[PDB]
Amino acid sequence: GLQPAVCLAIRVNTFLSCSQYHKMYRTVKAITGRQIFQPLHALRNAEKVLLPGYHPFEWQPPLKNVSSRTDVGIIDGLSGLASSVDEYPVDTIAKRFRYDSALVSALMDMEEDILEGMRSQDLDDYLNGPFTVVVKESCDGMGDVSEKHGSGPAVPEKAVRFSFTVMRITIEHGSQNVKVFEEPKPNSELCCKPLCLMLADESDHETLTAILSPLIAEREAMKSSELTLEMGGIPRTFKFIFRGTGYDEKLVREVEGLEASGSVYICTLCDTTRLEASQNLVFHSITRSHAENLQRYEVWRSNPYHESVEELRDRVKGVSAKPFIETVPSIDALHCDIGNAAEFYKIFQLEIGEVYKHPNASKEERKRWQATLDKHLRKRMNLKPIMRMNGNFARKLMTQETVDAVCELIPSEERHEALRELMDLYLKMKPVWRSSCPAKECPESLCQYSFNSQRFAELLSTKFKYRYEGKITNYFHKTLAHVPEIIERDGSIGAWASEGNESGNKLFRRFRKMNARQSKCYEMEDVLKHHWLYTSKYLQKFMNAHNA
């Protein structure tokens, strides 16, 4: 005996396609003689409960511009966009859920953990007090996604994924809010529920807006409302406080209405010129918001003070487009680490070439330096040369042994000491913006942060002025300035990182190849459904049922 739910959990979690599962079931049944595994149709029937559009729910007050039906599943991402010849050409296949249905399905799946945590917090398991659900949104733009032969629109070779993850649930049982659930691994791919999958270029602003507008409309509609849902008997009420902090820097620039990623304004958190950032490096403040960006765009369009182009650009600091997604200003840990690793790699390249003294940069010497650095790194730290910069190279490059090996190629000893001190300061600052709870895991490092940042800035301005005099990278500016304020505001930076969505990209790329139909009108639907089934805690609980 083996239940259909358990069979589905095994099949989904152990990366088995339907054909492979059918072969396994057929062989087991034929050889043993008893039906250990349930049939594929039974599994498909049993997989409908977990998917969206099955449980009844109510919204009080009723959602504005959103239908009241509670039986809607996978729907077309175009949202009825006109495909007529006369109108704007449409070359994009997209599939998405409804946001409210996805949230209600996620809450129904998490029901068991919610009740278990409520019991563990010494609270009676029948309260209907208004909860508070925190969901982090992520939007990522992939590349090198090959198109398929067949009839249909000439879709591009890049995809866009929009997903959400439930981070925290709190309930009021007095003068304080008690937490009943918290994700143990926020960046794990096992908790990143896809919501929309489209095949369109990230920089294709028109198509991106046309596809993603309904989701933003739903999110704005249900920011101020309550959701009543029957959970474990009693109906209970939930509230939602969305927090989108998973986008990368370029996508934040594109959706927040800011200018191109290369300009005189180089921060999505504050409004500071590159020269001012380079000359200050320490003291700033967070003074940017979605409503402020909307007002800035309105000022830019209306030109109320009748100013020229330069004066107008100074007045509206970088905003030249109307924002359409409300993103909380945040620092992405993964991309910050990647950028810092690339910066330190270039710093090592310069240092091993004696730029401070006798900087006779030769067209051949500039490549000799890179070649010798790459060979030395391969021989000592076992790192191969890579064109781009990824996370593992960053982690293996920021280690102290990397600087110890690089110092063998620098003739001077003062440069050795300066580089070692800089690397030590960076490594002391890193665990503050990467941990899931800085106030409890690295309290000394969290407290001793302003002094370390000031020393880092002073060293970078004194002993490395040959590169940073009127020029500081955006990630360096963010790390030096807005780490403590953002930690105080949110609680932990890194728990809201984009690692979950990046791993969901890998899961998407695997499923599109070996877990879905190969047609052009069904691949996105099948991939979305299988991904949602994969990120189900009810199914994942069986795989860990061995130990209790």
């Binding site: 511009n65 959103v66 239908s67 809607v72 729907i75 175009l78 949202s79 009825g80 966009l81 006109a82 007529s84 010849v85 006369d86 109108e87 704007y88 050409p89 409804r98 000439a154 591009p156 070779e157 920089s203 602003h205 028109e206 807006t209 046309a210 507008s213 309904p214 409309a217 739903e218 509609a221 200018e259 191109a260 300009s263 830019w300 369009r301 209306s302 030109n303 009748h306 100013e307 020229s308 182009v309 107008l312 650009r313 030249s320 487009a321 109307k322 359409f324």
Partner: protein, 344 residues
């Protein structure tokens, strides 16, 4: 009709379907690019310069007393006369309709340089709802100049809009709007001769009449071959508008109109059916009170144009039409269009 190929430089990606071409003192200007303006040309208006079968797009800086307008995608554009371009409606890159009137003129022209002035005007009265794909013309009568605006496409009203069909469109009411730019007042007239809405049609501006030919009714999904004549009388009191249906019309949608000679127009391009393009060109001869439409010679279309699925274009105002064909071959390649020029 002579057909030639024009090679576009490094601004090719800036040309997307639905753009607008303005004619100022023999010069051609381009508006309605793809995406929000970059830092190279923050204004959003370009100097469409074509010479020896080569196209260049140079930035143009607005004046200090102008409003930087967003990049529209299907505005209703009309000329006005001391020469102005009046644009209404359109779609911003964020896929939201705009209901603002922009008047664009020239402040000062330097040596091969032109500075524009853009002024936003707010309408009062029975203001037209946000829409795209409509037509606006200017009518002169008894020394008074007004504007006539017809219907197009629009999103569903906020009281009937659902996120499952957020991007769905429907034809506007067939009412005729009369706009006075001297005080910016709009009056709506419901004409019994107009029952089914139209979109992507052709409007011709005579002395005191506006002729409407072609269209695509969304409700019936047909392309009626009906020709309408809207006549506006402008006495000292309230204006009067009369609509007459006339025989001899043609069926076309999203066609391109050029003015080769006075009391004469040329219609090129369109879509007779969903996939059957209208390869024929029409000649419209206008009189003081009578009009006629005849069929002219079909130009020698190239291989790519005859087998293309879609084509767009605009009028340069000098008896020429600038029209494009999708490349449909983009393997990380910048060249995605095969622009051509046609001379009548």
């Amino acid at each position: 009709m002579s057909l030639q190929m024009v090679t576009v430089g490094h601004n090719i990606a800036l040309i997307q379907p639905g753009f607008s071409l303005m004619n100022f003192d023999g010069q051609v200007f381009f508006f309605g690019q793809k995406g929000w303006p970059k830092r190279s040309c923050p204004t959003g208006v370009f100097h469409f310069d074509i010479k020896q079968n080569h196209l260049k797009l140079k930035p143009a800086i607005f004046s200090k007393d102008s409003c930087y307008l967003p990049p529209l995608r299907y505005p209703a554009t009309c000329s006005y006369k001391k020469h102005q371009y009046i644009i209404h409606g359109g779609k911003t890159p964020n896929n939201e309709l705009s209901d603002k009137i922009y008047i664009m003129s020239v402040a000062c022209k330097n040596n091969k340089k032109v500075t524009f002035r853009c002024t936003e005007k707010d309408l009062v009265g029975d203001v037209p709802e946000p829409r795209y794909g409509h037509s606006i013309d200017v009518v002169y009568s008894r020394g008074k100049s007004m504007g006539v605006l017809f219907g197009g496409r629009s999103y569903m009203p906020s009281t009937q809009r659902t996120t499952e069909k957020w991007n769905s469109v429907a034809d506007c009411l067939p009412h005729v709007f009369l706009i006075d730019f001297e005080f910016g007042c709009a009056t709506s007239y419901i004409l019994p001769e107009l029952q089914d809405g139209l979109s992507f049609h052709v409007s011709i501006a005579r002395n005191d009449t506006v002729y409407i030919l072609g269209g695509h009714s969304l409700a019936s999904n047909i392309r009626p071959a009906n020709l309408y004549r809207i006549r506006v009388d402008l006495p000292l009191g309230t204006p009067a508008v009369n609509c007459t249906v006339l025989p001899g019309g043609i069926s076309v949608s999203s066609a391109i109109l050029t003015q080769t000679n006075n009391d004469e127009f040329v219609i090129v391009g369109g879509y007779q059916l969903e996939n059957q393009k209208r390869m024929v060109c029409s000649l419209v001869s206008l009189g003081d009170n009578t009009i006629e439409i005849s069929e002219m010679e079909t130009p020698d279309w190239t291989s790519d144009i005859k087998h293309s699925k879609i084509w767009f274009g605009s009028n340069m105002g000098n008896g020429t039409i600038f029209l494009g064909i999708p490349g449909d071959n983009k393997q990380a390649m910048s060249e995605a269009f095969y622009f051509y020029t046609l001379r009548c």
